[PDB]
Scaffold this motif. Structure first.
Motif, PDB file in Angstrom:
ATOM      1  N   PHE A  42       0.814  -1.209   0.000  1.00  0.00           N
ATOM      2  CA  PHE A  42       0.000   0.000   0.000  1.00  0.00           C
ATOM      3  C   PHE A  42       0.850   1.262   0.000  1.00  0.00           C
ATOM      4  N   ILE A  43       2.072   1.190   0.520  1.00  0.00           N
ATOM      5  CA  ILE A  43       2.986   2.314   0.382  1.00  0.00           C
ATOM      6  C   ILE A  43       3.479   2.408  -1.055  1.00  0.00           C
ATOM      7  N   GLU A  44       3.764   1.258  -1.675  1.00  0.00           N
ATOM      8  CA  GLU A  44       4.236   1.217  -3.058  1.00  0.00           C
ATOM      9  C   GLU A  44       3.173   1.703  -4.032  1.00  0.00           C
ATOM     10  N   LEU A  45       1.910   1.418  -3.742  1.00  0.00           N
ATOM     11  CA  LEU A  45       0.830   1.861  -4.604  1.00  0.00           C
ATOM     12  C   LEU A  45       0.489   3.325  -4.398  1.00  0.00           C
ATOM     13  N   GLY A  46       0.774   3.872  -3.220  1.00  0.00           N
ATOM     14  CA  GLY A  46       0.459   5.246  -2.900  1.00  0.00           C
ATOM     15  C   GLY A  46       1.462   6.275  -3.350  1.00  0.00           C
ATOM     16  N   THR A  47       2.476   5.880  -4.112  1.00  0.00           N
ATOM     17  CA  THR A  47       3.483   6.818  -4.583  1.00  0.00           C
ATOM     18  C   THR A  47       2.921   7.642  -5.734  1.00  0.00           C
TER      19      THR A  47
END
Lengths: 50, 161
Positions: A42-47
């Motif tokens: 979810f951090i990787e998708l939120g970039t």
């Protein structure tokens, strides 16, 4: 063979077990597995871009 | 704002002539295609929100434009994007019913390029969204009704580009 002074070629498992498996000398694969350390998806998708 | 009938009448009136055989043949062509236009308009009025959300699910979702920094990022921008796509589908339905794209450049394509260029709206991404909307509705209503929808969808994409 008349050119070199001896050197410690073999350890017992007691002596190797003494020196290597001490905590500072230790690696972290040595005995059980380690899982992979990825970041959260979810951090990787939120970039801001792929 | 004029359909095929009003444009034929306007040509024959700017001539000052009566309706000759070519105008009669054009109106016969429109009066043969009109029932198919009616049924495709009903089928498109059935599934407005589904066609719009499938167009976003094909093109704009999971790309950079819905991520931070994109122009479709916020909920306000998402709602305005759904509103813009609903406008494109509704006016393409109107131009399909009239059989003439005069309503599109009268009421969609009039100041749309300058509005989108002032806001910072990407024109290529919205052209791809309209193309996916065209692909979905041509899968919905069939081959020839999808083609006569896609001619006005291509008109909107050409005037936008």
């Amino acid at each position: 063979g008349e050119d070199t002074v001896p050197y410690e070629r073999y350890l017992t498992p007691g002596g190797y077990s003494l020196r290597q498996t001490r905590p500072g000398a230790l690696r972290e694969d040595v005995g059980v597995k380690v899982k992979v350390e990825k970041t959260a998806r979810f951090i990787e998708l939120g970039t801001s871009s792929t | 704002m004029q359909d095929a009938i009003t444009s034929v009448i306007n040509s024959a009136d700017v001539q000052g002539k009566y309706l000759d055989g070519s105008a009669m043949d054009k109106l016969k062509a429109y009066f043969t295609t009109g029932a198919l236009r009616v049924r495709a308009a009903s089928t498109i009025s059935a599934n407005a929100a589904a066609i719009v959300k499938e167009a976003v699910a094909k093109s704009l979702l999971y790309s950079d434009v819905t991520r931070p920094g994109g122009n479709m990022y916020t909920t306000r921008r998402y709602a305005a994007c759904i509103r813009d796509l609903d406008y494109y589908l509704r006016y393409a339905t109107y131009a399909m019913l009239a059989g003439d794209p005069s309503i599109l450049d009268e009421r969609v394509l009039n100041g749309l390029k300058e509005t989108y260029n002032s806001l910072g709206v990407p024109v290529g991404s919205t052209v791809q969204a309209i193309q996916a909307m065209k692909e979905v509705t041509a899968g919905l209503v069939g081959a020839d009704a999808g083609r006569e929808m896609g001619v006005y969808f291509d008109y909107i994409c050409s005037g936008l580009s």
